[PDB]
Amino acid sequence: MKLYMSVDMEGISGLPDDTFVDSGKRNYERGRLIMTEEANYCIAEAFNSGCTEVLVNDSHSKMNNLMVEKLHPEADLISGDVKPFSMVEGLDDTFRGALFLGYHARASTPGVMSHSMIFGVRHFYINDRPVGELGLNAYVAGYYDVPVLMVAGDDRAAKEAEELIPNVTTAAVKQTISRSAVKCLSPAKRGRLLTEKTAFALQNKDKVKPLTPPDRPVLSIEFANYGQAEWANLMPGTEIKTGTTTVQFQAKDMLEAYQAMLVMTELAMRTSFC
């Protein structure tokens, strides 16, 4: 059975702030080491639980964080950015399930290093339903009828996952105290947690269903300021909701909605004076 893995960084265990996730900062090298090892715990247990294939997609920033020379040798790594489907690149209907690792809470909510794709977004909406990276990626997984079996990260990401995906297995490797502070488990302790949770998730997979997205989903993105909204509103097919900093885009399907998100946020990232 093929298992898909999307690994982010903010939710990795032990990491309290961006000095561990920003490639240009002092604790980054330690961060990617811990990140790679955290993924190995899940990969190891994935194979040990019957999986014959495990696709690992680096889903953070430049997505060149996971160390290819230290990742589980029997796993296939997708490294690099500018991928057609970013965080869910390589995920198709041939996968038995998906596993989100090192995830964090969506923007504007409690949770360590909370945000959604870029600092500029406050909320993502798929037909009026509030979602973050977790939600959007789950919806893309749904498009391929692939269920999100497990989600690991801080306690807030776990809560956010289970409130969206029924019976989903969550692994809270750390507890959020503030947006830049957490109470975490020792690397070895989190390893057991992840090992057990991954095992249970794979055997309890039948109780989890794909997060089916609407046929012609309406993507809504609320940005922090009006400037970011103007930038995104440059993309054809978009419109700004008067009296707000929200930009909407009527998509043909979830896949088009995802890519519209990529482009709109990319444009918003160029906003100055903020």
Add this chain to the structure above:
Amino acid sequence: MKLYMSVDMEGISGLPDDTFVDSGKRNYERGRLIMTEEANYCIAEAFNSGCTEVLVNDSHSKMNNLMVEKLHPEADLISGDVKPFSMVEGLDDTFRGALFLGYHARASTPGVMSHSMIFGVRHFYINDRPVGELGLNAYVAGYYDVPVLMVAGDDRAAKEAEELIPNVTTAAVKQTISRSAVKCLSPAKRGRLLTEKTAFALQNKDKVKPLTPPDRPVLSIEFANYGQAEWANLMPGTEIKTGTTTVQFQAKDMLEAYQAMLVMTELAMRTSFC
């Protein structure tokens, strides 16, 4: 008659982006020159219209922008920051009226360089009523029973002013096209506009009333992310509205509410990972 002047920079005529208002950028020196001259037009007409005193308060960033060696010699300049009442420092009940120059639109709305005090705030609220710098400063002016006779800036700031202060005179020195683009009048052209508008404002002053604030106003600040809300929520007497990034503070009066704004935004400014 004593006239009070609060001069910001983003709304100054001819200025399209922050390269003209950020002391650390290439067009700053030209910006403060134009800013000082813009204020002189109003000061000159103020005296010409009978005013015996004109207090000019630099209300932008470090508030050391207006050039003391080029400002109207008969005017009194307040230069420097860390002032008890920031943008409205020096304003008391002994003034006949107030004049806001170089103002801009509040955060989250259309208007060149739109924002409210710091990049981190999305909305300011005084008893559920949406306001930005313009609103808050008007309310403090109201506390001293001083009416805001005139408000100058872009077309968006003007609109925002008149929708808050009945019969207020506005002078749109430039038209907003985007958050970093405008269609402006020549320096001399804006001068005439400001001269005429200032004259009319002073003679039509009887038709404008002070923006009286509530007795025990409730200050509400919605921040861009949860991290900024946590910082502000550190201040005694504050509370975060569950499910939001808004922090509230019950004040004794408008003056305490203003300072609470200064402190809460100052704290929010320290937020990292954004």
Add this chain to the structure above:
Amino acid sequence: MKLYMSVDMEGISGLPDDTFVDSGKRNYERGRLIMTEEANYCIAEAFNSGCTEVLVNDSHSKMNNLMVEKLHPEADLISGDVKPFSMVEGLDDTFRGALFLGYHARASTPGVMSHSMIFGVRHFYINDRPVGELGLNAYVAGYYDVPVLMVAGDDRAAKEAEELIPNVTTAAVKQTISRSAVKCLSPAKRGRLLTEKTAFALQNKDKVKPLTPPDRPVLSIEFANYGQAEWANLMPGTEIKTGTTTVQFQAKDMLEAYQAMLVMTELAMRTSFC
């Protein structure tokens, strides 16, 4: 009569290389001074020839080059970037004609500082017809039934203009020797040329017709490398022509085609390893 002006920098007289057009380089300040004065010659002659209104749109880079304090006082300046229609922002059907100043040759062809919007594009296509900034802007002018009366820049931009717009008046303020070298006229000499040419263009306006664009134009952009094509191909409604670095976009009208160009090139600008 209302006259629209789009002013770029590379084609301004006397400027041989990017040290005069890059805001971060040594000769930039002299460059924008010459640029502002060059525009004044045309503006002055525009009014002298009957025009009652002259809208000047800064169309270079951050578009904050023209100096508002030195531009003709009777002209209206659009300064700043992130404008819905970039180089042709503010142009509607109420204008008698358009005047392109300081223009340069399109990418991949002879001409000083030749390029099209960004360094990454090799060619722009509107229904298989090769065009650069000059062509695209002319087509947008055509959408509003406004004719391009005059085009000033180097000899190559002039040649490019006349091969696209019949009877158009051109003013070659300098001769191209290489992509970073030119034989130019003295500032005063170019002034006369521009003055005479602007006068003739306004009186010979009847002989020039709007460059009418197709109803549902197909925008094609050929990028320098495949990476830039992949970035642009992220935008919904786009497709890469197999075996090429060209991305196509079927637009509803010229206006949508223009904005699609803005977004696609903006995305391409992010391409690394080039």
Add this chain to the structure above:
Amino acid sequence: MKLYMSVDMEGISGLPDDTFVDSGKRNYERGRLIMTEEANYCIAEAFNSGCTEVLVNDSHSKMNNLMVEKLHPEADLISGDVKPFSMVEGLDDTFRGALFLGYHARASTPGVMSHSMIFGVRHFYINDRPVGELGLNAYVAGYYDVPVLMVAGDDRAAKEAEELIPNVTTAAVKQTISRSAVKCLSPAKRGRLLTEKTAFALQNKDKVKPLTPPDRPVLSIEFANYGQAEWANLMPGTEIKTGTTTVQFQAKDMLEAYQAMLVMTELAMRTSFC
């Protein structure tokens, strides 16, 4: 039994100056290594003495110093800043006792790297009683009826501790010679000292009582200069004692007094020209 641990850096053994505690300096990496190991000695002995839980709160600067990958695996680490209760975050009435590690002397007194929270404070006062970080944290511990069983650091911090908390156990890992010089014990030697002292502290716990704070404590902060006092005096409910650089704040309880300290010092930190 649950044991709470607050670990600072200046008082850590072997560390003579700030090159070992400032994340931006040459000896920082060695410093945090020694710091983590120093904490492990206490944690190990804590468990060995019966404790079932040990909460470790990084209480220095950005509080991301203790190394999660090297800390005792059976301990729970709180890493990160912007915590509601900074140095005493996570401390409640469910703890048997508290242990302060790597502490230093309060500002304005003898002791290596002496200070109180920020360089700008000279003295902290809780109802006229002189206290520093040690005192304030003890008082917050008192609010939860939790006694400070042990305090480790230099000889000056130890003396300061015992003069405030009767029968408290102190461990002087180093002797102060100057504010940036000390006579220290070898890493292994300090380890034994800490091991023995921690054991004795836990078994002699009955002789130590919580430092009960006043019901409505009055916080007083004397700053180095008047500028820092003005900044803090911006916070609602504060007042400057005429003729001094001291700012007072009447709190509802010790918890509000602590946060008022956090905010007032945070504001004072912004003071320029010092």
Add this chain to the structure above:
Amino acid sequence: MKLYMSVDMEGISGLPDDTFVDSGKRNYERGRLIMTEEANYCIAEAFNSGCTEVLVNDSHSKMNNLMVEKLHPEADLISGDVKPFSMVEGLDDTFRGALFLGYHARASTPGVMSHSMIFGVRHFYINDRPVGELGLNAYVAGYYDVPVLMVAGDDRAAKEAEELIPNVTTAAVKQTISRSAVKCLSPAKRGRLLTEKTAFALQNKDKVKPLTPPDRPVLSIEFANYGQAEWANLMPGTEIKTGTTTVQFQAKDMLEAYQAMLVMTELAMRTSFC
């Protein structure tokens, strides 16, 4: 009659913050221009009032601020640092009186840019009497039986002067609002004030007496932290008052006390971790 002038910068008119007095900051060049001109007003009036000689001593920082090429040609300028008597270098018993220009309030008290010699000192004491630069320089003037006829600076410096020197003439060129903010008079307005005040001071000189210092003055310096006290306590003849950050030095005369101040503060300036 010979007149002595000591010119500092913080108290100069129009200057709100250190960006105007720190040679390494953006507004310094404007600052020293205003400073030189401010001194010229007094020099001009000094000569116009009968004075035959005017010695001008640059008394700020590196003391190379006053511009020799723009200072009154008939005045003698002392430029440079490391002078035996710093701020009062060149002052002897052959002078009719002294004039302090651009002075500021002493450390730890209200007043724009308040401090005493270095940021590290909180208070200076001459036989238990609180004094700052103003006081110490007046005492040195007293040693030579020279009276301080006039003192110019902000309102706080003026107040401090008159509370120390009976009948002294003060000129408040600006009003203090905060340590980095003031309400100032136009350069020309301050000029008249200084001109009038200088004239009155010279003709009312008989009513002012020299601030005679004790025979064997005891210098006391209270520093911000203990580290600065330790540094100064290195100088032979010094002692730290237990329980404080104050260092005392028994001098033979006011001249020795002054130089002891120079050395003690110079040593304190080396203090790290502050």
